[PDB]
Amino acid sequence: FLEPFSADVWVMMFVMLLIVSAVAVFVFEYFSPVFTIGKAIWLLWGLVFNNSLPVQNPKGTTSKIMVSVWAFFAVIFLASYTANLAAFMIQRRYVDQVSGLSDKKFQRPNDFSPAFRFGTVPNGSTERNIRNNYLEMHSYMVKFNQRSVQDALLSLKSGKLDAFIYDAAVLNYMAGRDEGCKLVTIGSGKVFATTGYGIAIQKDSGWKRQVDLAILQLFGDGEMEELEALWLTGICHNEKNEVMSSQLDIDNMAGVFYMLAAAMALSLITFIMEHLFY
Amino acid sequence: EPFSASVWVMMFVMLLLVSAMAVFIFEYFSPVHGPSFTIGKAVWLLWGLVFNNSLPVQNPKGTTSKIIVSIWAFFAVIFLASYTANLAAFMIQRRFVDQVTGLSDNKFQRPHDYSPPFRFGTVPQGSTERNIRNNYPDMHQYMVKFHQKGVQDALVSLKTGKLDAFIYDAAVLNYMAGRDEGCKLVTIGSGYIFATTGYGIALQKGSRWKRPIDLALLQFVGDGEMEELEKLWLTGICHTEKNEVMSSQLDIDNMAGVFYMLAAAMALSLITFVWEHLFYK
Amino acid sequence: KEIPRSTLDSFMQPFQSTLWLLVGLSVHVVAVMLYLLDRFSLTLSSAMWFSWRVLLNSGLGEGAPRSFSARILGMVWALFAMIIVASYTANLAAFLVLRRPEERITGINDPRLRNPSDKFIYATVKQSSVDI
Amino acid sequence: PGRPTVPQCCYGFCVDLLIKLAREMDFTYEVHLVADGKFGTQERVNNSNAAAWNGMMGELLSGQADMIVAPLTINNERAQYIEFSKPFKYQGLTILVKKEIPRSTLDSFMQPFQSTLWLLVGLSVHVVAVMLYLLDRFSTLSSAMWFSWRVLLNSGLGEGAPRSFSARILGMVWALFAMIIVASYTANLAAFLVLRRPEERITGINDPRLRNPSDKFIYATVKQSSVDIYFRRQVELSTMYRHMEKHNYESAAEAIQAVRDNKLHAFIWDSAVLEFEASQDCDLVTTGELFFRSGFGIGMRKDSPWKQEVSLNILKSHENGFMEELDKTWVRYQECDSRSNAPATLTFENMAGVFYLVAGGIVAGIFLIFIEIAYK
Amino acid sequence: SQDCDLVTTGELFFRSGFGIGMRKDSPWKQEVSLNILKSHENGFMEELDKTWVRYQECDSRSNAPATLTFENMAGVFYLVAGGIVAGIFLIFIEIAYK
Numbered sequence A: 001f002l003e004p005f006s007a008d009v010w011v012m013m014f015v016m017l018l019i020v021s022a023v024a025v026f027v028f029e030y031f032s033p034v035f036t037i038g039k040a041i042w043l044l045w046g047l048v049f050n051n052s053l054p055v056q057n058p059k060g061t062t063s064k065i066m067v068s069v070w071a072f073f074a075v076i077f078l079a080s081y082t083a084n085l086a087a088f089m090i091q092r093r094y095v096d097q098v099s100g101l102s103d104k105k106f107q108r109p110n111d112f113s114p115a116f117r118f119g120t121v122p123n124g125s126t127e128r129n130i131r132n133n134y135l136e137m138h139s140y141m142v143k144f145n146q147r148s149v150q151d152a153l154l155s156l157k158s159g160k161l162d163a164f165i166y167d168a169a170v171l172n173y174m175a176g177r178d179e180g181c182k183l184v185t186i187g188s189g190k191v192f193a194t195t196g197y198g199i200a201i202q203k204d205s206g207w208k209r210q211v212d213l214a215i216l217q218l219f220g221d222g223e224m225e226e227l228e229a230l231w232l233t234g235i236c237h238n239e240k241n242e243v244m245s246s247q248l249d250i251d252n253m254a255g256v257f258y259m260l261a262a263a264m265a266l267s268l269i270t271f272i273m274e275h276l277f278y
Numbered sequence B: 001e002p003f004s005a006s007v008w009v010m011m012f013v014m015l016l017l018v019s020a021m022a023v024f025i026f027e028y029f030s031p032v033h034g035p036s037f038t039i040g041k042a043v044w045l046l047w048g049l050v051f052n053n054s055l056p057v058q059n060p061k062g063t064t065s066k067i068i069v070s071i072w073a074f075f076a077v078i079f080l081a082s083y084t085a086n087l088a089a090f091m092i093q094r095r096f097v098d099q100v101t102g103l104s105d106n107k108f109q110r111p112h113d114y115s116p117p118f119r120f121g122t123v124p125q126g127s128t129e130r131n132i133r134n135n136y137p138d139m140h141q142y143m144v145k146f147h148q149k150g151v152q153d154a155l156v157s158l159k160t161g162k163l164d165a166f167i168y169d170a171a172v173l174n175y176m177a178g179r180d181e182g183c184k185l186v187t188i189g190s191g192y193i194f195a196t197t198g199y200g201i202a203l204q205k206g207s208r209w210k211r212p213i214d215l216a217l218l219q220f221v222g223d224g225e226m227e228e229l230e231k232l233w234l235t236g237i238c239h240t241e242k243n244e245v246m247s248s249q250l251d252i253d254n255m256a257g258v259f260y261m262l263a264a265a266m267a268l269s270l271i272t273f274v275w276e277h278l279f280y281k
Numbered sequence C: 001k002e003i004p005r006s007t008l009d010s011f012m013q014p015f016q017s018t019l020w021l022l023v024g025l026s027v028h029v030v031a032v033m034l035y036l037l038d039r040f041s042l043t044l045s046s047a048m049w050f051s052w053r054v055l056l057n058s059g060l061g062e063g064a065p066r067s068f069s070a071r072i073l074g075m076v077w078a079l080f081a082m083i084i085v086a087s088y089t090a091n092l093a094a095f096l097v098l099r100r101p102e103e104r105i106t107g108i109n110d111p112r113l114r115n116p117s118d119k120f121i122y123a124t125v126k127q128s129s130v131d132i
Numbered sequence D: 001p002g003r004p005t006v007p008q009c010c011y012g013f014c015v016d017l018l019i020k021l022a023r024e025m026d027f028t029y030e031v032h033l034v035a036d037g038k039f040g041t042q043e044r045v046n047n048s049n050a051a052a053w054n055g056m057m058g059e060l061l062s063g064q065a066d067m068i069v070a071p072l073t074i075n076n077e078r079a080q081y082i083e084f085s086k087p088f089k090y091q092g093l094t095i096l097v098k099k100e101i102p103r104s105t106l107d108s109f110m111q112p113f114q115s116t117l118w119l120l121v122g123l124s125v126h127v128v129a130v131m132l133y134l135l136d137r138f139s140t141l142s143s144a145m146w147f148s149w150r151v152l153l154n155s156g157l158g159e160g161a162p163r164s165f166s167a168r169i170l171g172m173v174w175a176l177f178a179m180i181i182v183a184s185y186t187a188n189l190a191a192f193l194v195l196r197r198p199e200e201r202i203t204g205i206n207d208p209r210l211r212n213p214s215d216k217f218i219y220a221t222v223k224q225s226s227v228d229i230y231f232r233r234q235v236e237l238s239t240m241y242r243h244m245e246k247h248n249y250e251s252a253a254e255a256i257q258a259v260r261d262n263k264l265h266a267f268i269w270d271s272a273v274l275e276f277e278a279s280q281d282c283d284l285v286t287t288g289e290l291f292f293r294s295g296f297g298i299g300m301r302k303d304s305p306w307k308q309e310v311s312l313n314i315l316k317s318h319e320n321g322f323m324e325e326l327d328k329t330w331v332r333y334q335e336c337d338s339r340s341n342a343p344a345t346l347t348f349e350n351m352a353g354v355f356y357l358v359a360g361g362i363v364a365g366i367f368l369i370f371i372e373i374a375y376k
Numbered sequence E: 001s002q003d004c005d006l007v008t009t010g011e012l013f014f015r016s017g018f019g020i021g022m023r024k025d026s027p028w029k030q031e032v033s034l035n036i037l038k039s040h041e042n043g044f045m046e047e048l049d050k051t052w053v054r055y056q057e058c059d060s061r062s063n064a065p066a067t068l069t070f071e072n073m074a075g076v077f078y079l080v081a082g083g084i085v086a087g088i089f090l091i092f093i094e095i096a097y098k
Ligand SMILES: *[C@@H]1O[C@H](CO)[C@@H](O)[C@H](O)[C@H]1NC(C)=O
Pocket: A122, A123
């Protein structure tokens, strides 16, 4: 309801009241020789948002009816507002909390009061690289190091560990071949230290170029795609996940509640101000 | 209706709860103008509050009623929420699928009787013409009257409404759905053709390259390629997931159904008029 | 066949109960705040009824605000109450989110075909065309 | 329009990389862009009918440019002729094109409008007043009609139900159905929200429409683009090879434009150049799964005693996150909104109409008060 | 379609068709097929499949309202009745106090 709330809807509501206020005073005064107050403001309020307003109803024929029309359209808008929020409820990106290690949350667990946890397999190119670039991460993660990928998986899967770090191809296949689809690749699984598997040879004397040729013939033939589908291909293809009926969470409405409290305080000191006017 | 097995009775039961609430309330109201009309208002007043408010009603005073009412109001609210959820479920139920019985349907069997003008047809010199003539000769003659020749003739006719509907080899028609621009054409019901056959190849009666040919063919069936050829040529756009539809015209006949219930109520009120009309001395 | 789903009261615990406890408490504080100034220059029960009028949506209307400042207060708080119930209509909306995605198994794409899971046994009929 | 060599200023990711090397590397650099529009591919030389790939690469074989710094995909056909460094990026071909989605401003209320009955039944709500009068018999019109309007709108005006209890039963019925209708509408309003009218043609590899090309598939690539090798070698794609060829472009600016201009329904190219543009304009969309993956590498004449070092240097660039930092550094600056649904102040105009009607209303109001005056 | 506790996986693979079987030199082979073809075209085959197969079907019965979900509502109903009784004596005491 943010766009509508932001423009025209409020101004229009003031005008209907104001038109009615002019007509009501003139007409009402027309009806009775012997008034638009806050009550009129409440009426904009009563007609506009699902009733529940007990203060008043204007004693006139033209405006009151016009507003009943307004109210009916306004109800449609209310209904749509519900639908608008339903649209939110239709889907949600339940991926808000994530760390890519460029954030420094991983850099220190201690900054976060609960202890965080992440680990990797030792004697790896990953661990050596880590020790080379980031010392603190290595020295901290030695406690979270795991025996084997199935066992590392045991630390992630059964709880007692939050995040696991490993080779991207294995982690992507693992995501696809996941017993529980809940495990998901970090972000887009776009990996830092972008690398690829390599084939050894002795030294400058070897198969060299002829051997490489074969490799790029494989790409041309298109065999690798087939082999990928057979060996590499992954269960529960990584589409944006959809969450249904997720426990209610409030943070912006909390803000709204604070808006309320503040607005109150203002009106209270306004009353004080007014009092002083005297 | 689901609420009705348990919910409708409970609504009647809900009215019974109201009587007890009024009984607590009557004593409070009169330890010992004409508020006694309030219990009636509650049956009506309580009922209004039950459905989306919208009742001027009467203002109950008894202290207990406010609590009791708030308890009912809570219920009414979650009822409405429950009702909304049921409606929400219906949005799923609001999937529009073609309503027809195909060849079996009377629209095909006895076309003349319907006031509206519609016609079914098929391609000339087809194997089916004979089936039609060996099913309904008259239908075949009707098809002959409205003859077309190319797929696109039929297609356009269907897209323009020049042709009511069109029968052909389903396999091809499925392929047509496999290639529609805009996805406006569908098969009958599930799509069972109701004529069952598969493609065949000619051989000189004397010739038998086929018995030898057969062996090669089966493994080909077994082989993944048939499905590759399927994916190669038979793949079709807009795979038929139980289709879902929405309407800007809403429903006027469902609305009429609602209005019939409404009309019944009107009749009932006329009956109560009659009761007063002929009120006993 | 797949397993079933829980009842609405059970459903309420995930979102409705905590909010109801926190918010219900919040209404009383709001009612107290308006009176503060009013007190300075069963009233509490009446205020609660006015604030509850929004929640149940009973709108009993037993009592009305004492002062224009309270009305601004009412203008503030009444609008907030309306928002709170509209958010309850969002909760209303949430009840219909119970539909189950479920699971299906591909002939070749699925993991089971990929491996006869030790835990997941599958089979066919002996000496049949499927066996062949 | 006439093209001749021109002194120009060029700045780039590859330039920053090149200078990074130049600090790391002793060699000094002077750069000039290749005259040939395309990087170039080995092709028949007209009457000669046999020729070097030319363009950027042939100049390289030719020695015009000793080393080639550009975002060039690395492939075997080229690879035999020249040495290539380790590849910096791994971009995959996707098809960069889209159609603005069709959504409705007038659709939600319309559910009533078109139903027609929505209005007619409102009038019949008014008619119920006549039935009530009948109820009155053998036991105000303005108030009744207004009362009927209220049930549609929950007016709660004052007087309430007819004296006959039986008559009042219809009030419950009509308001019942009114309520139902509103709710039903809301559900159908949500039916609009359900949407899914759009159909995705993105899976190109498994796609049916792309494979069997037609005049509805005006499809291209860049004249002399590496994918043409794929179409060339893929006799399986010969059909498509030509279908594609007949529509090819000298450059991406024209190729993207055709889809933007809507001259061509679809465009086929690789990811590194295309996705950035996808962010840049975004009306257009990429679809399906990247096919024929490749990693970018520098092209140089054979035996370059530096390629190896270069490979080590770019390797380090990956190792130290430099390569990575640069890619985030430029690409990151461009973003595309995730699929989501927002109202966008469209359907609000009917209410604009309502407010216009208010004005008409109060104008009519002077004649309505004339009526009281008239009965003077 | 007969046992609602069992369901099929959606994919259909290895498309195949059943048939009658005879030795290659059977004198009834020419006759056996012509008969099968005639039964397909005539509709006899549809009568048999429809007659036997049509007996049973599974549908998504029940919708989602009340029922099991409503059982806890019973609990809710139990909760309304319990609250009022305490208020009686307590309310009377309050009245006595003031
Ligand atoms: C690396 O593996 C070797 C051989 O199993 C083992 O001795 C060593 O402890 C491992 N590294 C550490 C210190 O974890």
